[PDB]
Amino acid sequence: STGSATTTPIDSLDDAYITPVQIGTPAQTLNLDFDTGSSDLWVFSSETTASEVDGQTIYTPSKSTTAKLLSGATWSISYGDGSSSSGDVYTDTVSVGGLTVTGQAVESAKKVSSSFTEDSTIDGLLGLAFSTLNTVSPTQQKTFFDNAKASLDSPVFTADLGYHAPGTYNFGFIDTTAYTGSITYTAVSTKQGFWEWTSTGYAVGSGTFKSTSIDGIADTGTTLLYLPATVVSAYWAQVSGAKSSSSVGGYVFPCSATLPSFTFGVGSARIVIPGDYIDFGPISTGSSSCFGGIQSSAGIGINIFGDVALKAAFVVFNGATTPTLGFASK
DSSP states (O other), rough: OOOOOEEEEESSSSOOEEEEEETTTTTTTEEEETTTOOOOOOOTTSSSSSGOOOOOOBOOGGGGGTTTEEEEEEEEEEESSOOOEEEEEEEEEEEEETTTEEEEEEEEEEOOOOHHTOTTOOOOEEEOOOGGGGBBSSSSSOOOHHHHHOOOOOOEEEEEOHHHHOEEEEOOOOTTTSSSSOEEEEEEEEESSSOOOEEEEEEEEEEEOOEEEEEEOOOOOSSEEEOOHHHHHHTTTTTTTTTEETTEEEEOOOEOOOOOOOOEEEEEEEEEEEEGGGEESSSSSSEEEEEEEEOOTTTTEEEEOOOOTTTTTTTEOOOOSEEEEEOOOO
């Protein structure tokens, strides 16, 4: 089997991407944030505290003839941005782009934090990291990909995120028309439950490539590119007027600037992030200070190849017995 679904930016900045997902019988279509940095499939639901729902589409398990309460199971998750959600669990039929999993754990939110309530465009998350990170207790549950893998033509999914444009998540096949050149594959460590890999270095603009190992995670659920302070300082030093602002929470730059590109290494290959992808717009409406798309990881504990980096590439998440990641230009 295979599946193919279009993913669409939620706003003009590409802050996140939503992908339609069919849950239950008859289908209830929710727009979920596919997140390769987490491993829970959770949704706004008929059980979510009413004051915490503000425009999202909800899953109502009582209207699904295939929903079954997973007795005793609860979940609770906290994300790197400080947001969180929790609730109980059903199993139900879940389909993505024509690919169907029966018995998928669908985690029904009883509570969500303010940032989820405030984002009416995201109806939940679909985790695509390794199932060892799944938060369901007392019986940990498998991700959609883990459940689908055996049925897939090939045990892979791919992320092809657009810049200010829709893109595609494919399951079970590699669309050889979706990228240029060849795909360069690189080793993955699953020891932290992430798609964790080591970039071979970076360049700023037309500058020379610096060979240096940068361990980080391929995370479709994170907007920006978080890298070591040395690397980020070298980037922003090439932008007149750019500075790190403690009050804003990161590097800002004059909105009048033209940003340089940023290149990261994948083995001997190179992925170029155009400068425009690094512009996240005014810090507040009407400001001439703009927020940078490359930020320090120093306070995170891990480097994060988020959407800013991933949308510059066609990315293969290879879930073979020994997982690997593949990157191609496009």
